[PDB]
Amino acid sequence: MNIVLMGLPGAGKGTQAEQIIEKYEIPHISTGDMFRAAIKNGTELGLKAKSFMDQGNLVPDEVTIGIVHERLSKDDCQKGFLLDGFPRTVAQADALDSLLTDLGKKLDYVLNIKVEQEELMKRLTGRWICKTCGATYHTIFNPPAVEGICDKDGGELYQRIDDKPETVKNRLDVNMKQTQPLLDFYSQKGVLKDIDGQQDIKKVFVDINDLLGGL
Ligand SMILES: Nc1ncnc2c1ncn2[C@@H]1O[C@H](COP(=O)(O)OP(=O)(O)OP(=O)(O)OP(=O)(O)OP(=O)(O)OC[C@H]2O[C@@H](n3cnc4c(N)ncnc43)[C@H](O)[C@@H]2O)[C@@H](O)[C@H]1O
Ligand SMILES: [Zn+2]
Prior knowledge:
Elements: E1 2-6, H1 13-24, E2 28-30, H2 31-40, H3 44-55, H4 61-72, E3 81-84, H5 90-102, E4 109-114, H6 117-125, E5 127-130, E6 136-138, E7 157-158, H7 165-189, E8 192-196, H8 201-213
Parallel strand pairs: 1-3, 1-4, 2-3, 4-8
Antiparallel strand pairs: 5-6, 5-7
Helix pairs in contact: 1-8, 2-3, 4-5
The structure holds BIS(adenosine)-5'-pentaphosphate and zinc ion.
PDB class: transferase
Keywords: psychrophile, kinase, adenylate kinase, phosphotransferase, ATP-binding, Nucleotide-binding, Transferase
Assembly: monomeric
């Protein structure tokens, strides 16, 4: 199964990805995680992406497309994958469509996780993330068992720099401008499914799982 998670900042993509890969055991491919690993590794590409990410701006398409192309060509992506936060732009969706054709593959579903703006801001304001594994929590909506500690591994929780309200505003601005072009691209392709992301975590997954389980 070849799946795309799309959604505005805060919509619950990573949270749902954790649920999906637990049940289905396809690899989780996140462009955000790939950029963060390039940053940890200190590469030229990583260092160049960092300024965009800190500002809540999209990394330019050319770089992003090249890293996804390389990742998805690996042997572990040939029996299914979960793409999370790619494509974010019609140019990226165009390129992925070519890339997939060259691999003899196509998308099963693009899951558009829908959430109201106010809720998106409430979610990003209360978010804490494990520095080790990247699991995400929310002070109100999904707290860790003990404050400041990841439930899975005992890791330290941190606040992402781009979660500051002024940066969140820029992220929603920049990403909303891309939503309707992306929806139009995939509505045509017959793969788009809207998911009500504004429910309890496990109940959003009920809806996603209904789709995935039928594949
Ligand atoms: N393709 C691309 N092209 C160009 N640039 C790219 C790119 N991909 C990445 N980039 C660059 O990298 C940056 C970061 O990208 P990326 O890391 O992909 O971040 P993002 O797209 O902004 O999404 P978030 O991680 O903020 O949100 P999420 O939807 O996964 O929410 P979460 O599950 O954590 O949940 C959020 C909060 O809500 C809580 N929560 C989750 N679900 C629920 C629920 N159902 N109810 C209540 N709370 C919930 C969580 O606990 C958490 O606290 C980009 O801004 C850009 O600079
Ligand atoms: Zn952790």
